[PDB]
């Protein structure tokens, strides 16, 4: 695998704004009508996040500081995971999160990821809802000990946040309908916990895993046709700060302050 | 990309080849690598095929269990050990590439380049 | 897995040459199509049965269905007399066809 696409395209970053967004459970204590305050590591209010695009192929190696706040408006699955780790080489112990139509894998290995990770993704003739996808993620994947298969994470928007803490990797999502045009919804709503992996590792950089078609084809050049579909995703970082976090009737979170 | 056929010779039949196809260029290691042989004077024929990363690998049934094929990405090569050589076997081997990284799209793909082929001569 | 083709098919320079591929149901999978001039290696000039590589001239248009796929050579000309081999895949072992030969008068 691995195929090397990003040339030279060099377009500076743009940075949308996160109005009051990515807030999450921190804990797993059903809370009825009260206004708790917790002291957790949360996504400021209205902080610049920046917009990357999935038709530049925008794969670019992002710091992963003390928690990465993601969301993808994404309104056909493309944006198809996350190759967290501390130096994304060998000799390295890294992680991958990808899932591919109906289930989600997580492994923690010595991944060689390629330079340009991302998915080639094919429907084939016999049924038009296959999406046969084949891994360019890395070229070997060896001498590793995590494996975790659920059912998948994912013009609905897609919002994440992974924060990796006391050898706990924990996610949170929260996937809603958009019909906004191009940037994040101003209305308030709560991740929720996905899973809670015992991964024990050391995470400093993370990339995202796109999912391009193969629209034509040069006879040799493996980096011809690889056109991404349309999509945006949005990364923020997790700082630690106090929210004053509402609960409702029912228990959820309707509303916060920073 | 551009493949060059090597280590194809004439060998009396139970003999033994390593056949190696370097490629020009690095990005060989995208590319699933196809063994295709054309008999001297008969249509072209599918031999073996590896997957981009080499952990799938599938023969045809007339030479399953004799051939044993190899990528070393590192020195950008694609090998094929002719271990039991029969009469039949005698062609011109291609080295092609197909683009798709495994099995399962190799359907979606076509074996686009093609290295000038090394004949194969197993006789007396 | 078996494909049949035409041992050899013959048209006028200008006209429109017609080689067909015939399968067990190939109409269900993908058929890529080669040329191989005489003493050549092959160029693969139609893929997905529809598609063409970079650099194939547009007048190379195929098509597949049911249990035939057709190759359709427009404005057949002198350079286009070569050998055409169908191509599929089946439980990941791929399978060429006999080669139907293209004479250029």
């Known amino acids: 695998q691995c195929v090397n696409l990003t040339t030279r395209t060099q377009l500076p970053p743009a940075y949308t704004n996160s109005f009051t967004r990515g807030v999450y459970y921190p804990d797993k204590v059903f809370r009825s009508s009260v206004l708790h305050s917790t002291q957790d590591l949360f996504l400021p209010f209205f902080s610049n996040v920046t917009w990357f695009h999935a038709k530049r192929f925008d794969n670019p190696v992002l710091p992963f500081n003390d928690g990465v706040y993601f969301a993808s408006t994404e309104k056909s699955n493309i944006i198809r995971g996350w190759i967290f780790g501390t130096t994304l080489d060998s000799k390295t112990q890294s992680l991958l999160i990808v899932n591919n139509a109906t289930n989600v894998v997580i492994k923690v290995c010595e991944f060689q990821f390629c330079n340009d990770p991302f998915l080639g993704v094919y429907y084939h003739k016999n049924n038009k809802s296959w999406m046969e996808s084949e891994f360019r993620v890395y070229s070997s994947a060896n001498n590793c000990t995590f494996e975790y298969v659920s059912q998948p994470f994912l013009k609905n928007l897609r919002e994440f946040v992974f924060k990796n803490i006391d050898g706990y990797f924990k996610i949170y999502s929260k996937h809603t309908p958009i019909n906004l045009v191009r940037d994040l919804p101003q209305g308030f709503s709560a991740l929720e916990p996905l899973v809670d992996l015992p991964i024990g590792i050391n995470i400093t950089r993370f990339q995202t895993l796109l999912a391009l078609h193969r629209s034509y084809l040069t006879p040799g050049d493996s980096s011809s046709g690889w056109t991404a579909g349309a999509a945006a995703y949005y990364v923020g970082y997790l700082q630690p700060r106090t929210f004053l976090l509402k609960y409702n009737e029912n228990g959820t979170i309707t509303d916060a302050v920073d | 990309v551009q493949l060059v056929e090597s280590g194809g010779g004439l060998v009396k039949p139970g003999g033994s080849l390593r056949l190696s196809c370097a490629a020009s260029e690095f990005t060989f290691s995208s590319y699933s690598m196809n063994w295709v042989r054309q008999a001297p004077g008969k249509g072209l024929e599918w031999v073996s095929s590896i997957s981009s990363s080499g952990s799938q690998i599938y023969y045809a049934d007339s030479v399953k269990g004799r051939f044993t094929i190899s990528r070393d990405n590192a020195k950008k090569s694609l090998y094929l050990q002719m271990n039991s050589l029969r009469v039949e076997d005698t062609a011109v081997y291609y080295c092609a590439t197909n683009g798709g990284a495994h099995s399962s799209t190799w359907s979606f793909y076509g074996m686009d380049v093609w290295g000038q082929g090394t004949t194969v001569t197993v006789s007396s | 897995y078996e494909l049949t083709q035409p041992p050899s098919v013959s048209v006028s320079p200008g006209q429109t040459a017609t080689i067909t591929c015939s399968g067990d149901?190939?109409?269900?999978?993908?058929a890529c199509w080669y040329q191989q001039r005489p003493g050549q290696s092959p160029v693969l000039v139609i893929y997905?049965?529809?598609k063409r590589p970079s650099g194939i001239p547009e007048r190379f248009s195929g098509s597949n269905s049911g249990n035939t796929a057709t190759l359709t050579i427009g404005g057949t000309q002198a350079m286009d007399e070569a050998a055409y081999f169908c191509?599929?895949?089946?439980?990941?072992?791929?399978?060429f066809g006999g080669g139907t030969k293209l004479t250029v008068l």
């Open positions: 191509q599929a895949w089946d439980s990941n072992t791929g399978v």
């Open positions: 997905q049965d529809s």
């Open positions: 149901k190939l109409g269900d999978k993908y």
